[PDB]
Write an enzyme that holds these catalytic residues in place. Structure first.
Site, short mmCIF file in Angstrom:
data_model
loop_
_atom_site.label_atom_id
_atom_site.label_comp_id
_atom_site.label_asym_id
_atom_site.label_seq_id
_atom_site.Cartn_x
_atom_site.Cartn_y
_atom_site.Cartn_z
N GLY A 140 -11.73 -3.97 5.81
CA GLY A 140 -11.44 -2.64 5.32
C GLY A 140 -10.20 -2.00 5.90
N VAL A 169 -8.19 0.06 3.09
CA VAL A 169 -8.81 1.29 2.60
C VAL A 169 -8.90 2.33 3.72
CG1 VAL A 169 -11.18 0.51 3.03
CG2 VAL A 169 -10.71 2.21 1.22
N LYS A 174 3.35 -2.16 6.52
CA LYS A 174 2.69 -3.46 6.52
C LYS A 174 3.77 -4.50 6.78
CE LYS A 174 -0.87 -6.36 5.50
NZ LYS A 174 -2.32 -6.29 5.84
N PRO A 175 4.08 -4.78 8.04
CA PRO A 175 5.23 -5.66 8.33
C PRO A 175 5.04 -7.09 7.87
CG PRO A 175 3.99 -5.19 10.34
CD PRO A 175 3.42 -4.30 9.27
N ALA A 219 -19.47 2.79 0.87
CA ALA A 219 -19.20 1.55 0.16
C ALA A 219 -18.60 1.84 -1.21
CB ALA A 219 -20.49 0.74 0.01
N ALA A 267 -15.49 2.75 -1.70
CA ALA A 267 -14.50 3.82 -1.65
C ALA A 267 -13.17 3.39 -2.27
CB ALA A 267 -14.29 4.27 -0.21
O1 LIG Z 1 -7.69 -14.89 11.65
C1 LIG Z 1 -7.30 -15.86 10.96
O2 LIG Z 1 -8.08 -16.82 10.71
C2 LIG Z 1 -5.88 -15.88 10.42
C3 LIG Z 1 -5.60 -14.88 9.29
C4 LIG Z 1 -4.45 -14.12 9.35
C5 LIG Z 1 -4.16 -13.22 8.34
C6 LIG Z 1 -5.02 -13.07 7.26
C7 LIG Z 1 -4.66 -12.06 6.17
O3 LIG Z 1 -3.75 -11.33 6.36
C8 LIG Z 1 -5.37 -11.99 4.93
C9 LIG Z 1 -5.07 -13.31 4.07
C10 LIG Z 1 -5.17 -12.92 2.77
C11 LIG Z 1 -5.08 -11.27 2.73
C12 LIG Z 1 -4.81 -10.84 4.01
C13 LIG Z 1 -5.47 -9.44 4.25
C14 LIG Z 1 -4.67 -8.37 3.50
O4 LIG Z 1 -3.43 -8.52 3.32
O5 LIG Z 1 -5.23 -7.33 3.06
C15 LIG Z 1 -5.54 -9.04 5.73
O6 LIG Z 1 -4.55 -8.51 6.29
O7 LIG Z 1 -6.59 -9.25 6.39
C16 LIG Z 1 -6.18 -13.84 7.21
C17 LIG Z 1 -6.47 -14.75 8.22
#
Ligand SMILES: O=C(O)Cc1ccc(C(=O)[C@@H]2CCC[C@H]2C(C(=O)O)C(=O)O)cc1
Ligand SMILES: O=C(O)Cc1ccc(C(=O)[C@@H]2CCC[C@H]2C(C(=O)O)C(=O)O)cc1
Lengths: 227, 226
Positions: free
Chosen positions: A15, A18, A38-39, A199, A201
């Site tokens: 989350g 959101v 969001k870098p 939930a 949202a």
């Molecule tokens: O820990 C780990 O195994 C390594 C790892 C590292 C980055 C992500 C992500 O970044 C996810 C991938 C798809 C969407 C991403 C999601 C978003 O962009 O909303 C997020 O930031 O969580 C998932 C797993």
């Protein structure tokens, strides 16, 4: 400058996005200027775009990205699969510093969990927070297993003296079960729970989302974030 | 004494019990005496007795435990729901130390993840590993998110100077897929991957499970445990 706040989580899909939109909407309604960053964004080939979702939910136009990778995996693996490279540690910091301004709340949403590698070698969002002297907001779930992951994340923050701004439960069910209710009480003893977003949202329209955001957070805490 | 290994995981439902059974079965076939200890167990109303599953899968008879709670919650929460406190820190440490003997591999399976409270006040499996001077085997998944959870767990181990005996993937999917295949390569860069148990291994009969276990682990690493 103003207030920089990194928004991390116990993992992925908990989350983070959101919560960024919810806090951005609450801060905007309090008269605080908000930028969301969001870098590192993976999964763009699957349609994932957290900045676009934050602007859709909270109406935030000041959105800043840097690296985008197609595959929905870790940034290191997503960059390797696209023949690209991860950004530099100073590129991420520079992106955040250019947004920082007095009276502004700058939210920096990580990719995945706290210790995910965002830059080589092994540079994580925790290292970024030290560079920009930002506290950390940790998004958690209410499901089984959240207590271990929350304790692990807060201990990792303390290891680099990154202050924890509190917890936010990304999805709160109605009605809550025995596990969810027990988890929320146990999480409150670990750190201060700033909000528990209901939930679904993320499926609300802009009007309903703004009303949910203003009621989810303590206005004294939101107003106290930026002076 | 012998060798004490605490077996933790990145969370719950990651395969801690089946990994304990698999390593126990591989060590037994290597001629090593094996004991398994689950000090605190929850969710027994659903019928999950992890020690009973270890005995059925690996044939271990020295199965030690102290408390069983019916609710599928954290030990502290299940204890509060039943109105009965958790065991003491000395109960768990002395039980494990009494199990340990020369030539024996003693596996201590935790409840949930590493920082789960097993005894009051706030005593975790990490604290227990420090008292009994045990290393930690970390059970992980191959799914998206395992990299962050593994790194968080290994950092928590190093924060208390608890040596890491390696990683075990609790369930290897078939077919693997892009994320799973990538995670297995990245996990090996973080720590030694001792084994990756195939998906569905928890449903094997005793004979089939013993054959899988002998092939899943390196026979030289298992033999060198004691
Ligand atoms: O820990 C780990 O195994 C390594 C790892 C590292 C980055 C992500 C992500 O970044 C996810 C991938 C798809 C969407 C991403 C999601 C978003 O962009 O909303 C997020 O930031 O969580 C998932 C797993
Ligand atoms: O982290 C948290 O939120 C706290 C927490 C702590 C312990 C568990 C468990 O112990 C689970 C509960 C049901 C069965 C248990 C399971 C097994 O015995 O098979 C395991 O050991 O993981 C789950 C969550």
């Amino acid at each position: 400058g103003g207030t920089i706040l990194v928004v991390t989580g116990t993992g992925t899909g908990v989350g983070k996005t959101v919560v960024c939109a919810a806090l951005a909407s609450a801060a905007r309604q309090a008269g605080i200027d908000v930028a969301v960053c969001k870098p590192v964004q993976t999964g763009t080939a699957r349609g994932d775009d957290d900045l676009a979702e934050v602007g859709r939910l909270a109406g935030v136009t000041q959105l800043a990205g840097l690296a985008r990778y197609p595959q929905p995996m870790a940034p290191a693996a997503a960059a390797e699969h696209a023949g690209m490279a991860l950004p530099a540690r100073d590129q991420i910091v520079r992106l955040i510093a250019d947004l920082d301004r007095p009276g502004r709340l700058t939210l920096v949403e990580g990719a995945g969990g706290l210790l995910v590698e965002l830059a080589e070698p092994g540079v994580t969002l925790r290292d970024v927070a030290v560079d920009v002297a930002a506290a950390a907001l940790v998004v958690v779930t209410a499901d089984l297993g959240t207590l271990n992951h929350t304790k692990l994340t807060l201990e990792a923050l303390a290891a680099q003296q990154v202050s924890c701004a509190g917890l936010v439960i990304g999805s709160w069910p109605d009605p809550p079960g025995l596990v969810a209710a027990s988890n929320r009480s146990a999480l409150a003893r670990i750190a201060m729970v700033r909000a528990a977003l209901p939930a679904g949202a993320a499926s609300l329209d802009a009007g309903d989302f703004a009303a949910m955001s203003a009621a989810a957070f303590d206005r004294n805490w939101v107003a106290g974030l930026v002076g």
